[PDB]
Design a binder for this molecule. Structure first.
Ligand SMILES: [Mg+2]
Ligand SMILES: [Mg+2]
Ligand SMILES: [Mg+2]
Ligand SMILES: [Mg+2]
Ligand SMILES: [Mg+2]
Ligand SMILES: [Mg+2]
Ligand SMILES: [Mg+2]
Ligand SMILES: [Mg+2]
Ligand SMILES: [Mg+2]
Ligand SMILES: [Mg+2]
Ligand SMILES: [Mg+2]
Ligand SMILES: [Mg+2]
Ligand SMILES: [Mg+2]
Ligand SMILES: [Mg+2]
Ligand SMILES: [Mg+2]
Ligand SMILES: [Mg+2]
Ligand SMILES: [Mg+2]
Ligand SMILES: [Mg+2]
Ligand SMILES: [Mg+2]
Ligand SMILES: [Mg+2]
Ligand SMILES: [Mg+2]
Ligand SMILES: [Mg+2]
Ligand SMILES: [Mg+2]
Ligand SMILES: [Mg+2]
Ligand SMILES: [Mg+2]
Ligand SMILES: [Mg+2]
Ligand SMILES: [Mg+2]
Ligand SMILES: [Mg+2]
Ligand SMILES: [Mg+2]
Ligand SMILES: [Mg+2]
Ligand SMILES: [Mg+2]
Ligand SMILES: [Mg+2]
Ligand SMILES: [Mg+2]
Ligand SMILES: [Mg+2]
Ligand SMILES: [Mg+2]
Ligand SMILES: [Mg+2]
Ligand SMILES: [Mg+2]
Ligand SMILES: [Mg+2]
Ligand SMILES: [Mg+2]
Ligand SMILES: [Mg+2]
Ligand SMILES: [Mg+2]
Ligand SMILES: [Mg+2]
Ligand SMILES: [Mg+2]
Ligand SMILES: [Mg+2]
Ligand SMILES: [Mg+2]
Ligand SMILES: [Mg+2]
Ligand SMILES: [Mg+2]
Lengths: 262, 158, 134
RNA sequence: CGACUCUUAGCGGUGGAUCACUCGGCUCGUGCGUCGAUGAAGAACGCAGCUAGCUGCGAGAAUUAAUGUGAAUUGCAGGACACAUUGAUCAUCGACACUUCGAACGCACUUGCGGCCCCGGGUUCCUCCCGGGGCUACGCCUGUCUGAGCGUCGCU
RNA sequence: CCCCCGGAGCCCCGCGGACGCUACGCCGCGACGAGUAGGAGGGCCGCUGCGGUGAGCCUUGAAGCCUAGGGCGCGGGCCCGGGUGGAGCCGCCGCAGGUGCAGAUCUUGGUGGUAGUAGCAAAUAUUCAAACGAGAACUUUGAAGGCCGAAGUGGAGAAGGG
RNA sequence: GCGAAAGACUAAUCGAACCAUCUAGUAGCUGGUUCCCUCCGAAGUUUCCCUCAGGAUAGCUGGCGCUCUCGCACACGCAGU
RNA sequence: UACCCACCCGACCCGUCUUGAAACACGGACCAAGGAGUCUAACACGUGCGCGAGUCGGGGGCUCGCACGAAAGCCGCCGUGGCGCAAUGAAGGUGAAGGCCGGCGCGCUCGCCGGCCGAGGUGGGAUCCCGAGGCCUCUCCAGUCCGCCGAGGGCGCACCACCGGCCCGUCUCGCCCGCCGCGCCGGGGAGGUGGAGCACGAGCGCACGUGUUAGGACCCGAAAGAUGGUGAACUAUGCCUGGG
RNA sequence: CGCGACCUCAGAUCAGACGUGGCGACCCGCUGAAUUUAAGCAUAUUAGUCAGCGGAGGAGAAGAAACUAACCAGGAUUCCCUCAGUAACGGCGAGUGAACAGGGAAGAGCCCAGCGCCGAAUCCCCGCCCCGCGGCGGGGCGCGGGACAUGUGGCGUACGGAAGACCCGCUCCCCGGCGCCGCUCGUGGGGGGCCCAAGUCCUUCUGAUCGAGGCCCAGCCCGUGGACGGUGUGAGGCCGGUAGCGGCCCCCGGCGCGCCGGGCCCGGGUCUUCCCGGAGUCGGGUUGCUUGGGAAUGCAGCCCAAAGCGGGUGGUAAACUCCAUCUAAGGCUAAAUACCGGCACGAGACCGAUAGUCAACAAGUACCGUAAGGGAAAGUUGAAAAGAACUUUGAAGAGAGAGUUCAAGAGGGCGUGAAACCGUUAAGAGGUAAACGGGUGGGGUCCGCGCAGUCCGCCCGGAGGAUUCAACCCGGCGGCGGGUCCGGCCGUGUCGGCGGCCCGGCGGAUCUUUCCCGCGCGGGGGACCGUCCCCCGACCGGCGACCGGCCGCCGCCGGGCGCAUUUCCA
């Protein structure tokens, strides 16, 4: 509030009464008389620089920046190393860019959605999520942020034909429409590579959503995939190709312990 | 106390700004108050151009905006007794009427009369009553449409 | 997840909707399930407990199998008193010990003109939704 | 081994830190946008079987009828009730009620003085006297009534 | 002929490479190390909260607190042992702060030394016996001595108090 | 305001009351300014200023770099000489 | 190592202003909790990231009752607009090209017509290219493969130093003009000089740091000033009415 | 010296109405500082801000050009982005500081006076009846009043209008009721009431669990419900709830047909005849405040004080002079717009009892001040009071036993219970105040040990004892790698197909209007180029992008191998 510890009418009778020079509360027959107000130091008072409302709360990103944050988010949803390294319990999943039939868009009972996540061997992620339930550590308990859990597999769908009703109760599962992807849900915590479960209809639109390499997006105005600072991202093969090996000074590995001078 | 090659920086905070600071946390909720009105008005006048009545073709005044063309305030009077639309009637058939436009040229006159001849042709007048007289377009081209024109009617493209 | 805005779900707000809740509301809150036998016959899951219903204690130190009859309802203390649910004080003068209805099972409803229209309209509502999903 | 003193530890006080809670705030949104001479906001004084304070109420005073609700209320009494009953209690609230001040309004602020009408006792309007009810503030509008003017005239 | 390392048997091996290789990791040489005001860097230094994550911990005892208990770090601090305590809590990767106190005649609260000390010294005065009582220098009654001495320490009022 | 006058008195306040606000008034001036380790490390001088308890600009300081050199048998450059 | 004790040596109480503090300088009995460089805007440079002569971002719009959403996504909106892409003059205004060759005006360091090249040159220039010659290889010689060294020679980025050149302002001086008009019309030249200029670009947006300001502005601190109010129950007088 | 009109003006406790006060976040008139800044200060600045005062509303104000502009021109107001920290102001310093255009939200326009026309065509209040009555009205009837000729009503208002002539085309809306039909978006409008899934299943902890394993798919069931709260811990299933075009009952809102009562003879275009605008205002002089507005933006006071092809504006005074552009002096108006008050809600990277509002509590309370005003402290027993009966000592406060409790080492200011400080027990010390740094020594509390700590781990040799293999082949499985790129799939660079090209599209100020559709333009086709796709063939990167066979090796399983082997143990 703009009025914190600033409705007191204290004068600071000072410099000769041996006390402090702090604005002290006027007159009275209470305890709060000659106490000290308008001080960051003193009981009551206000803080240092009262938190004001016009703090620049919200932030900004370039359009292409937050588009190409989704490419790297998606490209890492493949590559099971990156995916498992986020602890997404993919050890029995048949393939990592997991595509499902478009029957799933029309499920309308959580029983079927639960049955799907067994046959794809995706249970173990919700299983994990199911186990990660507990109370938050801090004072966040008494502000409506009591319980916490992991994130589960994300499911992407091209049209809400009832699917979001099915996979609604299963904890950890989030639903993301293709045309409305979201970095805050594809890569939670600024870490990369969360499990995704694409349906066939959505898996097609992905190249038409934001583009292949030698073709425009054709759903975004003007946009194409980012190019590579380097192609052969592996250098273990580069460093033992015959081109490089041939043109190298021979090594020096006779580590020369210092000689004691006799 | 300046130091070593800055700017001069007259910033306007001497007066009292902290009191009259207007924060914009309404901004996303106002986007929604307007959106309902925009929709609730379209559903209230159901068969009707949602954008509103038809506005005329018009040129921008100053020499820097010479070559553009706008949607004007309303079709002028001199325009109207060429297309043969009474000035009080046009207000009732979705034609903005501006009784304040001095026409100086025949170029911008005919160019702007054409939109009124064009409006008539693709205009479907639901008749006054269900069983009603002339100038109300037939029931064939009454069943065919309930279409509100989303966006401006016949958008003026430069 | 709750969806309807115009409902609260706020840790301290519906703790406040509880211990300031008027006696008229506190009937529904002080409701206790029905035994498997009645739960079959009426198709009613739970009931507001009444003054002279029969009851079995299910949790607590002296959960058991003996069927007592309720004696009163401390709707202000928000907890009921039962028949042989009682301890001995220091002077031998026995007192009842409160039991929460949620921790007790009803074994024989006390029927009434009022209670019967409740059991009907509870059951009629339960099979209306099962007919709606059907 | 004297006592005192000091350091440390075991326990015991003194004190209320830390920690864990939270029917409270603060901030930001949303809907609405609701006073009063038919007497407001505010103030006073009263009102519970045992009740000081908070709260709730207004001599019909911890509420009235009504409608939902449907067996309590509770600190202790005490109770009606028939819990097959407007039916205990709570919620709603739309019927009725609204002590004294207060723009406050018969004049004044002592709580004092009046006037004018009516209706009881008194009277047999006999005037008090006693009791009860209705009026009696300022400004202004429209109309109404009674007027004033060597103002303008008209008729005489 | 003078041959093949799936085998020369290896102090050189170019055919395959460490335990070592978190490649912002590991290793070998040298040189050098004062410090206020001030700057910079590093802080698996610490505090609260959020997005992740730890198939984390927890009524077989969490936070806090207490410890002549065993230790680690140059240090910020940290880990363990026991104890009491009775419900929650921390590790890592990122984000956010009202984030670290010896001091400001700092603020609020608490507590000492001073100290069982200064003090309980303005208007001459008390004593005996009894009663009551668990208990009497101090109450009450009786007796004795006394003072105020009617411009009163007496008898009634105003304002004020309630 | 009131003063037979002392700047007296005006509710313990008077060379100019008390109360709340403008108000977190201004301060070239006192006081304080909270964890470790590592590396570098000053000034009190210059000109101008209603300047002399302060600033401005010079220096002195640190950080960030870059351009190259060649101890990789094969160096130009600088210097409190 | 930490508890108590003993000894030998060392050793003044911290914070602070200060040329100088153990100071006969000031703050500090003790212990807990609180307690001081913050946010916003505006510049500046450094740094990270996206895109790149462009690049946005806002306000709007299109998509929700948000659970997570007052988020995310999308829009010839995306350029209306800002910043950049161009300067220079007070202003009317003008506005970044030169070189070369041939031909034609008398090549007159002047004017015009056809062709070629296009951002000039010098000196350093990281530096790549070419490389004479070497240096072996078990023989004498032959000879193609592979590198090491490599005198000498070439292109030469970035940048620095310099000379040129062009744009605009101003001056000087001087020539020829074009002619929808008439020249108190307009247009060109040579030489100097003013410019935050061009001389084949580097910006935009988003982060973070440091610094300087405007903000209460690192926290605490005046003597004052102003606007409205409340007091004569004390006391200062005057009055009214009582008492001595 | 009368009576009667009217004009002025009084009095009524006359009939009927209405105004005051409160709130005050946002709003509208006026008033109006000084701290401060300028390193002094007086102009400036703070600032048309605080205080003062008046007045409202659910929004207010503004608003239909006496505008902007100089353009090939725009078209009420308000708000947002922008203009732009720019034009201008300023001891030209500190500092101040707009607009126009453009984009967008929203979008709505209208009345008078006058001039005229109309027999005042008008309005108000009475009195009787018809309907209606909890926003007092409609219908009719009355020599019942009165206002009005010093001016009410209809047409009409500058965009032109009226009146005429003839040109053309044919006529439902409004209101008072009376009903009735569709409950009418959060996906049934507003409000209320009542209602709608699934374990208290096994075992086990515990004072009590909502915990830990388990239970026909992370176990059983439900899941359009797994938010939250309650419950003797940590609960989707126990309870309330939650989800759900879920159900049911009232009420209210709002819109849709019928009946009735009344109102209403309401058009459109052409030619002519007239008809016109708001005065102590504009404008000028001047003085004062104001803006940024400058030889004067706006506002005022005083003085002067108009015009009718006039007047204002056209951002340096002035004359002359042309152009442009509006129409002042009268009035009404929804929408976007604002809300630190109020009612009712929702949320949070917020605070968590010295924090967060002064106020988590009997808080604007206790209390102070004559008064204006000032103004606190103070949350937690347990889960349930089960709040200590009884015995005993004491005048009593307090104790000792007992009891309750999971716990009273939770006892009514009672969770946790720190430090200072104090009490006592233990241990050690003690003439240079204590404390301290380095170095050891002595004693302690514990801690590690050992009742040898001789620490282990290979390999080997020897002596004991025991089970089955390794080595080898044979059957099967599964890999690895390899190349013949062998066969096929895959993709890079190239070439060919001009084959997708129209059975590939998108883009392009490329081109054609020979086209088509619509009104030179727009839309659509057809031509063109750039780009992206099919057929096949060739070369090459043969690429971690595979599949099949062949091979080589490995491994596991199963067989065969019975013991100079191969393992175990001591
Ligand atoms: Mg505070
Ligand atoms: Mg619009
Ligand atoms: Mg002790
Ligand atoms: Mg203790
Ligand atoms: Mg406290
Ligand atoms: Mg007269
Ligand atoms: Mg050092
Ligand atoms: Mg904590
Ligand atoms: Mg507890
Ligand atoms: Mg914080
Ligand atoms: Mg602290
Ligand atoms: Mg005497
Ligand atoms: Mg007396
Ligand atoms: Mg000094
Ligand atoms: Mg000195
Ligand atoms: Mg000295
Ligand atoms: Mg000093
Ligand atoms: Mg002054
Ligand atoms: Mg008022
Ligand atoms: Mg100053
Ligand atoms: Mg100063
Ligand atoms: Mg001064
Ligand atoms: Mg001034
Ligand atoms: Mg001003
Ligand atoms: Mg004000
Ligand atoms: Mg208005
Ligand atoms: Mg108006
Ligand atoms: Mg405008
Ligand atoms: Mg700009
Ligand atoms: Mg100003
Ligand atoms: Mg008229
Ligand atoms: Mg349930
Ligand atoms: Mg639960
Ligand atoms: Mg719970
Ligand atoms: Mg004027
Ligand atoms: Mg001014
Ligand atoms: Mg001029
Ligand atoms: Mg007007
Ligand atoms: Mg407290
Ligand atoms: Mg606390
Ligand atoms: Mg507080
Ligand atoms: Mg406590
Ligand atoms: Mg506490
Ligand atoms: Mg305990
Ligand atoms: Mg306890
Ligand atoms: Mg305790
Ligand atoms: Mg001792």
């Amino acid at each position: 509030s703009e009025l914190a510890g600033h409705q007191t009418s204290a004068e600071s009778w000072g410099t000769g009464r041996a006390v402090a020079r702090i604005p002290r509360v006027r007159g009275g027959g209470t305890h709060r008389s000659g106490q000290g107000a308008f001080g960051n130091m003193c009981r009551g008072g206000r803080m240092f620089a009262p938190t004001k409302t016009w703090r620049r709360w919200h932030r900004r990103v370039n359009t292409t920046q937050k588009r190409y944050a989704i490419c790297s988010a998606l490209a890492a949803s493949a590559l099971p190393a990156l995916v498992m390294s986020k602890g997404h319990r993919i050890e029995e999943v048949p393939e990592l860019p997991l595509v499902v039939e478009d029957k799933v868009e029309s499920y309308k009972k959580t029983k079927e959605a639960v049955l799907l996540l067994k046959k794809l061997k995706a249970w173990n992620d919700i299983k994990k999520v199911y186990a990660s339930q507990r109370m938050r550590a801090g004072k966040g308990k008494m502000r409506n942020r009591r319980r916490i859990q992991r994130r589960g597999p994300c499911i992407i769908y091209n049209e809400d034909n009832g699917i979001i009703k099915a996979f609604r109760n299963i904890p950890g599962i989030t639903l993301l429409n293709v045309s409305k992807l979201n970095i805050l849900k594809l890569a939670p915590g600024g870490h990369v590579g969360r499990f995704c479960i694409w349906t066939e209809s959505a898996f097609r639109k992905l190249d038409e959503l934001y583009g292949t390499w030698r073709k425009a997006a054709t759903l975004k105005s003007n946009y194409n995939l980012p190019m590579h600072k380097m192609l052969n991202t592996d250098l273990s093969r580069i460093l033992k190709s015959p081109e490089i090996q041939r043109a190298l000074r021979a090594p020096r590995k006779k580590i020369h312990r210092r000689v004691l001078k006799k | 106390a300046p130091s070593r090659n800055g700017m001069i920086l007259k910033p306007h905070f001497h007066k009292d700004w902290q009191r009259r600071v207007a924060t914009w946390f309404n901004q996303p909720a106002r986007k929604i108050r307007r959106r309902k009105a925009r929709q609730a008005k379209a559903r209230r006048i159901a068969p009707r151009p949602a954008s509103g009545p038809l506005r005329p073709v018009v040129r921008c005044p100053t020499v820097r905006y010479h070559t553009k063309v706008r949607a004007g305030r309303g079709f002028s009077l001199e325009e109207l007794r060429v297309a043969g639309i009474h000035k009080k009637v046009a207000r009732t058939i979705g034609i903005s009427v501006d009784p304040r436009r001095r026409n100086k040229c025949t170029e911008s006159l005919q160019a702007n009369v054409q939109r009124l001849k064009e409006y008539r042709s693709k205009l479907i007048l639901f008749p006054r009553k269900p069983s009603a007289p002339k100038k109300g377009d037939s029931s064939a081209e009454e069943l065919k449409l309930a279409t509100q024109l989303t966006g401006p009617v016949m958008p003026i493209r430069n | 997840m709750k969806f309807n805005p115009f409902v609260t779900s706020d840790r301290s707000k519906n703790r406040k909707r509880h211990f300031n809740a008027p006696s008229h509301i506190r009937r529904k809150i002080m409701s206790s399930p029905l035994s498997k036998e009645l739960r079959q016959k009426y198709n009613v899951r739970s009931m507001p407990i009444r003054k002279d219903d029969e009851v079995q204690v299910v949790r607590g130190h002296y959960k058991g199998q003996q069927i007592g009859k309720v004696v009163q309802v401390y709707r202000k203390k928000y907890v009921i008193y039962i028949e042989r649910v009682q301890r001995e004080k220091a002077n031998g003068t026995t007192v009842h010990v409160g039991i929460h209805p949620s921790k007790v099972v009803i074994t024989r409803l006390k029927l009434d003109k009022d209670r019967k229209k409740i059991l009907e309209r509870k059951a009629k509502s339960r099979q209306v939704g099962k007919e709606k999903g059907k």
